[PDB]
């Protein structure tokens, strides 16, 4: 599914099968993900995680 | 050590500590650092990164080429 | 920032920016660096890797996990 | 082809397929290699450098 996140203030948006690895601060779920062959960023609030980029965190939570 | 660079026009500065990622393009290094609980983004010339940014860049290019 | 191990039975310091490459193995820090034009290898426990070191591990897991 | 080499002193040997990054100072060529999904590295003296790494030693010194 697509996300749409901020990075530094910005509107982005990725979908989740880029997405590499996960974690939570607060209200903040921060992720990085494949950028076309380099890392990239992004933060979106939980509550505006799709369920899939949930279904990462808890599992990244997991393995902590 | 610390890594000075612009964020939208004002002067940031990251401890590399923070950096969980180093990138370059042509000249540009670009980094990915932890910031009170979000992910930010960097870039500075390479002539502005310090030695400890440069060190790690060498390292995710050669991480980059072992497969 | 030094690393230091047994090299041989032999005790061994190693700066942190000489070091190549890092991997682990279980609770095993394995790590490639630099020394007098001659490429090493070091093993530490965890315990004994500097934070320095064990970021650098974090960097290189995660470039592996990039494709 | 075959690369004998020694790593802390003792001899090992590894296919040049899996060689990756190659420099020399003095009479020693440094190398990292692919040793089965992470890095292993090894010194060979010049003189005992097969054609085929000779050959990536100067293609990598090209490249600096
Ligand atoms: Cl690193």
């Given at each position: 599914?697509?996300?749409?996140?901020?990075?530094?203030?910005?509107?982005?948006?990725?979908?989740?099968?880029?997405?590499?690895?996960?974690?939570?601060?607060?209200?903040?779920?921060?992720?990085?993900?494949?950028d076309n062959?380099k890392?990239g960023?992004?933060?979106?609030?939980?509550?505006?995680?799709?369920?899939?980029?949930?279904?990462?965190?808890?599992?990244?939570?997991?393995?902590?």
């Open positions: 599914v697509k996300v749409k996140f901020l990075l530094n203030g910005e509107e982005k948006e990725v979908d989740t099968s880029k997405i590499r690895d996960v974690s939570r601060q607060g209200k903040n779920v921060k992720f990085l993900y494949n062959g890392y960023a992004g933060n979106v609030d939980e509550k505006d995680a799709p369920k899939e980029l949930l279904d990462m965190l808890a599992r990244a939570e997991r393995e902590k």
